[PDB]
Write a protein that binds this DNA or RNA. Structure first.
Ligand SMILES: [Mn+2]
Length: 475
RNA sequence: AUGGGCCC
RNA sequence: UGGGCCC
């Protein structure tokens, strides 16, 4: 997005500058090339001369403006995908009830009870529990007063900028490349959920290549599904984006919202409106108030769905801008936000598509960093999706999600105070797919000190998960 | 110390 | 409730 104005204000907002992530016994063994994001301006580890506050916002390189032609083409691609999407999902997208939006419905989890409330509630020193009753699903407004302002299309807000406390590669860490989280007001998240919560639930439950969204999936069981599909195509591309979320141009965002959330698809007219408030935003980082145009904030309720929708529309637009006769069945794809696998029997030229993606502000490069650009021939077994490869399991003959050993070493090397036992249980569910020799090796540093689930136990758990029949078939 | 998968 | 992973 394009930063339009920067200004200071008397009232400073608190920004958390203390990493909870301390190392573990594994850190001494594995010596990962990874470590906590730099949160403090004066961390000893940053490359001098530092300036976090400069790097953090450097992702905003502008707001690409599209020609009339390109906008019309994008509108065709957005409307076409919207057709495919609402065909599969149906058109039951009426406003979710205030109760439902808090409590969730089938395929849509409840709202978090004690997460950040956003602005202006953080200036008042107040938590979500004070503004909303989550056990019940009503009361405490305040909020209602915001509801009405949104209902009357005159609500305004600002995003509260937090620094993401997370493990990152040390090169990123040294360079002060700390990611930021754009916390929206809890009433906005609520209203967006009311406006498009049924739609989001339907997408989650209908995830897969057809709608081109992996949002709602469970890699353990769905890697079989996804893997088999993508193995039928001659060419499979692993497309990376650079700052996908920040570089959505205001024209693309507005048109997507107009075409995908029409009233004629069962949406309340404020569905479109509430999403359109994500385009031009105000952001509060300590004393600074930064106003931005373009880009998606991370804290919206449907951030993943929205990026995923955009991702789908971008690929159709890019292909149609270069080639002719390009339709939805020309290729296949699944996306989770910026993350994407594309495939086609046609020998598509993604290196030539680069400039057409540039017309939307987006910069594509190959995942396989090998000197050359995009090429044909790559199969499903070469690519990554959600930090997981597709490897065929020798025992069951199903695809399983395999994370790279180095990524697992990094995950295991750090933990928040007192979460280490839980962490190892959870992470073993990931590690099991690396095979038993690698599984033991990854957990060796913890033997004697914690409970490490056996390889066999989790293997049998996974067989029943992916295919309950194959589990019984062995017995 | 966001949102939303999923898992415990 | 409270953890972990991915985006
Ligand atoms: Mn624009």
């Amino acid at each position: 997005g394009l930063i339009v104005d920067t200004r200071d204000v008397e009232e400073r907002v608190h920004v958390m500058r203390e990493t909870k992530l301390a190392p573990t016994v594994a850190h001494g063994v594995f010596n990962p090339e990874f470590g906590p994001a730099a949160l403090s301006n004066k961390d000893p580890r940053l490359n001098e001369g530092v300036v976090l506050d400069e790097v953090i916002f450097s992702k905003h390189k502008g707001d690409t403006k599209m020609s009339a032609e390109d906008k019309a083409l994008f509108r065709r691609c957005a409307a076409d995908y919207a057709s495919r999407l609402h065909s599969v999902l149906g058109t039951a997208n009426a406003p979710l009830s205030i109760y439902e939006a808090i409590k969730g419905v089938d395929g849509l989890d409840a709202m978090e009870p004690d997460t950040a409330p956003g602005l202006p509630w953080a200036l008042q020193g107040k938590r979500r529990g004070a503004l909303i009753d989550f056990e019940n699903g009503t009361v405490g407004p305040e909020v209602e007063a915001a509801l009405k302002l949104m209902e009357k299309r005159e609500y305004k807000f600002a995003c509260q900028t937090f620094l993401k406390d997370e493990i990152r590669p040390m090169e990123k860490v040294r360079a002060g490349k700390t990611r930021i989280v754009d916390v929206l007001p809890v009433e906005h998240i609520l209203y967006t959920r009311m406006m498009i919560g049924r739609f989001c639930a339907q997408m989650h439950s209908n995830n897969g290549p057809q709608i081109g969204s992996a949002v709602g999936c469970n890699p353990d069981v769905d890697w079989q599904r996804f893997g088999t599909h993508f193995a039928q195509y001659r060419n499979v591309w692993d497309v990376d984006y650079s700052a996908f979320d920040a570089n959505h141009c205001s024209d693309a965002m507005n048109i997507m919202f107009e075409e995908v959330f029409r009233t004629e698809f069962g949406f309340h007219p404020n569905a479109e409106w509430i999403l359109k408030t994500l385009v031009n935003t105000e952001h509060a980082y300590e004393n600074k108030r930064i106003t931005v145009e373009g880009g998606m904030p991370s804290g919206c309720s449907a951030t993943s769905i929205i990026n995923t929708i955009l991702n789908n529309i971008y690929v159709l637009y890019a292909l149609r801008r270069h080639y002719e006769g390009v339709e939805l069945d020309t290729y296949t794809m699944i996306s989770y936000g910026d993350d994407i696998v594309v495939a086609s029997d046609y020998d598509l030229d993604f290196e030539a598509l680069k400039p057409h993606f540039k017309s939307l502000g987006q910069t594509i490069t190959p995942a396989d960093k090998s000197d050359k650009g995009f090429v044909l021939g790559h199969s499903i077994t070469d690519v990554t999706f959600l930090k997981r490869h597709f490897h065929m399991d020798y025992g069951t003959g199903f695809y399983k999600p395999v994370m790279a050993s180095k990524t697992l070493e990094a995950i295991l090397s750090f933990a928040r105070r007192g979460t280490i036992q839980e962490k190892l249980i959870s992470v073993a569910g990931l590690a099991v797919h690396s095979g038993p020799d690698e599984y033991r090796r990854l957990f060796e540093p913890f033997q004697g000190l914690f409970e490490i689930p056996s390889y066999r136990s989790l293997y049998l758990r996974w067989v029943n998960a992916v295919c309950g029949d194959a589990a019984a078939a062995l017995e």
